[PDB]
Design a protein around this nucleic acid. Structure first.
Ligand code: TTP
Ligand code: MN
Ligand code: NA
Ligand code: NA
Length: 327
DNA sequence: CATTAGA
DNA sequence: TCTAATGT
């Protein structure tokens, strides 16, 4: 956590660099387990060789340690840190829509800067077009004060649309978070459960409303279960307009909301921690259910959940407020 | 780790 | 059909 900081950290630099600038998934895989092990590593690495003992540590990575321990730096991370071609891939990739592959191609054609990106809006596709178009807004944080105005409206149409609908703004915002990056609407409905051969309009009806009133401004990807877009607060009685924010809404078969909800309400840790335990408590929890476990090694049999609570009791525990699901 | 665009 | 991207 701190005893092996740089090490894991340098490691990750190196790895991320292997995966992005270079399409060397293996080496990339090298650095991660490694960086993962030295990480569990309970003592101060004193040298290459010491580390070298561990699994995942070969000679190359060992080699890197020494030099890092020796000169408080690293040549390659130095060289790399400098290199535009790579500096560039590190950068372009920040536009929603540009992944590494594209990142590379762009550069190749010589598309290094944001401006480059504009002059070639032609080369870009819808996601990435909207991507660049809200480069600023998408990089900003969502003040909770705003989180609440948004939540306010979402719930309102959703409801005006059909009352039978259930919505939940999940994620950090749900867990108190002073700010949030993207908004997460978990959505389900009675009519939609595990079986009932869908009803796409369910997603659809809503997406539209939200657009009609003018909250949803753009579309990144609408699907029959996951619409994914951009929204904005009604720039008041002017002067201060609102930043465009990333919004996401997904339909859920009503018979899987709570787990689902438990889940997206995080955190990553409270989550695992809960999962790791449900296990002890003779169960299993995943993004959608809670099945009683059985001795042949594994079982099934999806227990019926009516609230975050049900899931709780099931593994027999104390309800944990969103506010306090920190870990 | 699944759901979407896209070519 | 694959294959990239986002998220989670
Ligand atoms: C898990 C935790 C959240 O459910 C989910 C991730 O949604 P994310 O948007 O990836 O994360 P978050 O909601 O915790 O963070 P924030 O809203 O501040 O961006 O997966
Ligand atoms: Mn979020
Ligand atoms: Na990107
Ligand atoms: Na392949």
């Amino acid at each position: 956590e701190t005893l092996n900081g740089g090490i894991t950290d340098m490691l990750t630099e190196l790895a991320n660099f292997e995966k992005n600038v270079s399409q060397a998934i293996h080496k990339y895989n090298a650095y991660r387990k490694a960086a993962s092990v030295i990480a569990k590593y309970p003592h101060k690495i004193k040298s290459g060789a010491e580390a070298k003992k561990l699994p995942g540590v070969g000679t190359k990575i060992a080699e890197k340690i020494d030099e890092f321990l020796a000169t408080g730096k690293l040549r390659k991370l130095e060289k790399i840190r400098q290199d535009d071609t790579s500096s560039s891939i590190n950068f372009l990739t920040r536009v929603s829509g540009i992944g590494p592959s594209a990142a590379r191609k762009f550069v190749d054609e010589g598309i290094k800067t944001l401006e480059d990106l504009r002059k070639n809006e032609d080369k870009l596709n819808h996601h990435q077009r909207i991507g660049l178009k809200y480069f600023g807004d998408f990089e900003k944080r969502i003040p909770r004060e705003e989180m609440l105005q948004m939540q306010d409206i979402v719930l309102n149409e959703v409801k005006k649309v059909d009352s039978e609908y259930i919505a939940t703004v999940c994620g950090s915002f749900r867990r108190g978070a002073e700010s949030s990056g993207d908004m997460d609407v978990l959505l389900t409905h009675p009519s939609f459960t595990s079986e009932s051969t869908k009803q796409p309009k369910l997603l659809h009806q809503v997406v539209e409303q939200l657009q009609k009133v003018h909250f949803i401004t753009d579309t990144l990807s609408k699907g029959e279960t996951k619409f994914m877009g951009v929204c904005q607060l009604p720039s008041k009685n002017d002067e201060k307009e609102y930043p465009h924010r990333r919004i996401d809404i997904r339909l859920i078969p009503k018979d899987q909301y709570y787990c689902g909800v438990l889940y997206f309400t995080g955190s990553d840790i409270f989550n695992k921690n809960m999962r790791a335990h449900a296990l002890e408590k003779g169960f299993t929890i995943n993004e959608y259910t809670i099945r009683p476990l059985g001795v042949t090694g594994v079982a099934g049999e999806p227990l019926p959940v009516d609230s975050e609570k049900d899931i709780f009791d099931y593994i027999q525990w104390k309800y944990r407020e969103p506010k306090d699901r920190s870990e």
